[PDB]
Design a protein around this ligand. Structure first.
Ligand SMILES: *[C@@H]1O[C@H](CO)[C@@H](O[C@@H]2O[C@H](CO)[C@@H](O)[C@H](O)[C@H]2NC(C)=O)[C@H](O)[C@H]1NC(C)=O
Ligand SMILES: *[C@@H]1O[C@H](CO)[C@@H](O[C@@H]2O[C@H](CO)[C@@H](O)[C@H](O)[C@H]2NC(C)=O)[C@H](O)[C@H]1NC(C)=O
Ligand SMILES: *[C@@H]1O[C@H](CO)[C@@H](O[C@@H]2O[C@H](CO)[C@@H](O)[C@H](O)[C@H]2NC(C)=O)[C@H](O)[C@H]1NC(C)=O
Ligand SMILES: *[C@@H]1O[C@H](CO)[C@@H](O)[C@H](O)[C@H]1NC(C)=O
Ligand SMILES: *[C@@H]1O[C@H](CO)[C@@H](O)[C@H](O)[C@H]1NC(C)=O
Ligand SMILES: *[C@@H]1O[C@H](CO)[C@@H](O)[C@H](O)[C@H]1NC(C)=O
Lengths: 319, 211, 119, 14
């Protein structure tokens, strides 16, 4: 349809070329399959779907903006609704559906979130083991070199700072339109490629006309095939160019997906010590949120404050 | 398991199959006319005279070059994917085989203990040995023990309790121990900690001081 | 117009196939019966069931197909078993046993090295 | 130059 447009004479000439259609279809299929693979590696990190308790008794820590909202027709968190609302044919070019729908992504995301809130990282290694949320935090504090005294003595302080930070994120994402530029850019690049490919159909490529039907209605075979044969290589060149660019671009997306999957395992289903890997500051924990064509992580970190100057020494001399 | 399941090594077989297909597609483009009177140069030359023979050759010649450039571009892209895999494999050997990694689900699922490499055609197979917790039991807990008005926190473990007694144990494997001054440490009073419970912390010096 | 996809159990097992018509909103230009109309197009020749299972041959838009006791069926894939964790502000679960498990991971390292004489 | 507190001393004397 792209090259000949159901012209019989063009098809017969297209058959004189190599198995280019086969190669183009294999390349695009390979990309299409990979895209579902990427989605599964990033989100299907948990073998069970964990449910939350009624949302109560988390020690003052409020997860309402990141947990699914039961009143909605689509069970997404308030933050996910904001993320979704921020990201914005007959020539043989079609679009295939994803294997995992937004609803299935939402279920994996809520499973991981329910899992980390009620069992910490244990669900990622073996069975989920329930733990009071504040005790989970105590361990996360030990994990950054801070004793447990700090968490319990300041539990109210910590819960309030946490709750404040989540609220700020929801407002920040709503306010700034560039906040999700990384996902919008992917969409825009792919749209441009398709909206460039369909325009090459208007090109003559040295032929008397861009349209096969005009060549055939006005010229006789000894000349008509010559003109068709220019358009036919013109259109094939455009398709090969398109496919090559999609393969390169797909590789970049795969690299991003591999990183996203790594982060979910190390930032969401554990506590990482890799510097500035799971957000700036000392990592405590993180929570995933879904977004069109991607994943958004909320990284919770500990940042030291209000330092004071003290005199020091490597050792004390006693007796 | 490896002997029984033929799909077990599909990742290496897929590489082999893709490369075979590329070569077995490239050689078939030699049969194409590309608009020429014949796919064969010798037929063009034995039947046509130079003013026309070169014209026909010149179509096949760009046809074959197009096939080769297509082949090479695809091999370069594919090679990049293999390189990324190789870089990961090298990373895993350093971190999983020549060490003990704490990266979650990086060196197998579960808590990583060790791993052993095995070779395979065109690749590497790792056997990752991990520790998986089992047979958990439910216990009552608390963040601290209130002794004489002072608050006691565990040094390493977690305070747990059965129906009548409080114990302190290591987090990853139940092994209850007496709550003592050598297992806990003190900070703050029995006021600020939420959920602190009434218990007795054993003093290990007291009986020696009296004996 | 649209693409036509053929869902095939391996031929060493069965010669039944099901066919998916990409842009048909059933309004199909071939046949009827066993028609499941979904977002991925019309799947004709498969039995839709109200069960859910692990995905085998993916179709799209939440639907997978498989060959089961015989016919080809269409189903919503399951995302996994449910697990309600007994979260409580005073309850902790602690392992009392363990298993040493060994799993495998396979990675490609190299591809065939080839060269071409252009002449 | 500083003093390191000995926690047993007062119990040994009491
Ligand atoms: C978590 O934070 C939200 C704020 O986003 C709280 O929402 C309030 O809920 C009460 C009771 O339904 C309403 O009267 C308020 O108008 C809501 N606030 C806003 C800004 O709309 C929610 O109650 C908090 N939950 C917990 C457990 O702390
Ligand atoms: C860190 O400094 C703050 C001062 O900003 C201490 O107390 C908070 O003060 C602000 C401003 O008056 C209040 O809005 C907060 O509600 C106060 N926190 C609490 C828990 O009441 C804070 O206590 C200091 N940090 C620590 C660990 O002591
Ligand atoms: C909680 O564990 C303690 C032991 O750690 C159990 O107490 C012991 O029970 C045995 C009989 O089985 C007695 O001979 C010991 O003298 C008891 N020890 C102490 C310190 O009293 C206790 O029964 C367990 N509680 C429950 C409800 O199972
Ligand atoms: C304290 O300083 C003096 C020098 O003024 C030195 O001789 C002595 O060893 C130091 N330490 C102790 C414990 O006396
Ligand atoms: C035990 O509980 C009582 C209240 O019944 C409280 O006054 C007391 O401080 C608690 N702790 C100790 C060590 O007595
Ligand atoms: C746990 O919740 C119960 C019921 O509201 C309450 O009585 C108890 O004091 C709470 N314990 C802690 C540590 O928060």
């Amino acid at each position: 349809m792209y090259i000949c447009g159901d012209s019989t004479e063009c098809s017969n000439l297209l058959l004189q070329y190599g198995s280019f259609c086969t190669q183009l279809n294999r390349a695009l299929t390979g990309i299409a399959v990979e895209q579902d693979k990427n989605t599964q590696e990033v989100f299907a990190q948990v073998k069970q779907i964990y449910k939350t308790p009624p949302i109560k008794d988390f020690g003052g820590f409020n997860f309402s903006q990141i947990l699914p909202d039961p009143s909605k027709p689509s069970k997404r968190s308030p933050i996910e609704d904001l993320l979704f609302n921020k990201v914005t044919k007959f020539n043989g070019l079609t679009v295939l559906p994803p294997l995992l729908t937004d609803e299935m992504i939402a279920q994996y995301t809520s499973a991981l979130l329910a899992g980390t809130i009620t069992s910490g990282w244990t669900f990622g290694a073996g069975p989920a083991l329930q733990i009071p949320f504040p005790m989970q935090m105590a361990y996360r504090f030990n994990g950054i070199g801070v004793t447990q005294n700090v968490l319990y003595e300041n539990q109210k302080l910590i819960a309030n700072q946490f709750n404040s930070a989540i609220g700020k994120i929801q407002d920040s994402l709503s306010s700034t339109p560039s906040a999700l530029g990384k996902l919008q850019d992917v969409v825009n690049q792919n749209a441009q490629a398709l909206n460039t490919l369909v325009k090459q159909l208007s090109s003559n490529f040295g032929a008397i006309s861009s349209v096969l039907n005009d060549i055939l209605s006005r010229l006789c075979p000894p000349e008509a095939e010559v003109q068709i044969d220019r358009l036919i290589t013109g259109r094939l060149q455009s398709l090969q160019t398109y496919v090559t660019q999609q393969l390169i671009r797909a590789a970049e997306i795969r690299a991003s997906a591999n990183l996203a999957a790594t982060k979910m395992s190390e930032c969401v289903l554990g506590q990482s010590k890799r510097v500035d890997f799971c957000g700036k500051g000392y990592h405590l924990m993180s929570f995933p949120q879904s977004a069109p064509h991607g994943v958004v992580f909320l990284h919770v970190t500990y940042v030291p404050a209000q330092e004071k100057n003290f005199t020091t020494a490597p050792a004390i001399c006693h007796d | 398991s490896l002997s029984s399941t033929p799909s077990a090594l599909g990742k290496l077989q897929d590489v082999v199959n893709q490369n075979a297909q590329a070569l077995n597609t490239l050689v078939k483009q030699l049969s194409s006319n590309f608009g020429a009177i014949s796919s064969v140069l010798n037929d063009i030359l034995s039947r046509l005279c130079p003013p026309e023979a070169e014209v026909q050759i010149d179509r096949l010649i760009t046809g074959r070059l197009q096939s080769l450039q297509t082949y090479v571009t695809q091999q370069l892209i594919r090679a990049a994917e293999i390189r990324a895999s190789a870089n990961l494999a090298a990373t895993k050997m350093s971190e999983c085989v020549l060490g003990q990694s704490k990266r979650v689900d990086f060196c197998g699922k579960g808590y990583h203990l060790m791993s052993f490499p095995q070779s395979a055609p065109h690749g590497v197979v790792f056997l990752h040995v991990t520790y998986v917790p089992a047979q958990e039991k439910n216990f009552t807990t608390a963040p601290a023990i209130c002794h004489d008005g002072k608050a006691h926190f565990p040094r390493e473990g977690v305070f747990v309790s059965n129906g009548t007694h409080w114990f302190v144990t290591q987090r990853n494997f139940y092994e209850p121990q007496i709550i003592t001054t050598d297992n806990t440490f003190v900070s703050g009073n029995c006021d600020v900690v939420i959920g602190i419970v009434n218990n007795t912390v054993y003093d290990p010096l007291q009986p020696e001081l009296d004996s | 117009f649209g693409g036509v996809s053929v869902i095939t159990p391996g031929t060493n097992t069965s010669n039944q196939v099901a066919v998916l018509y990409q842009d048909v909103n059933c309004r199909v230009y071939s046949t009827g019966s066993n028609v499941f109309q979904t977002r991925a197009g019309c799947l004709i020749g498969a039995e839709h069931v109200n069960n859910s299972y692990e995905c085998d041959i993916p179709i799209g838009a939440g639907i997978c197909a498989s060959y089961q006791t015989q016919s080809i069926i269409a189903y919503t894939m399951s995302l996994g078993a449910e697990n309600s964790v007994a979260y409580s502000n005073n309850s902790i679960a602690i392992p009392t046993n363990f298993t040493i498990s060994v799993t495998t991971e396979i990675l490609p390292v190299s591809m065939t090295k080839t060269s071409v004489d252009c002449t």
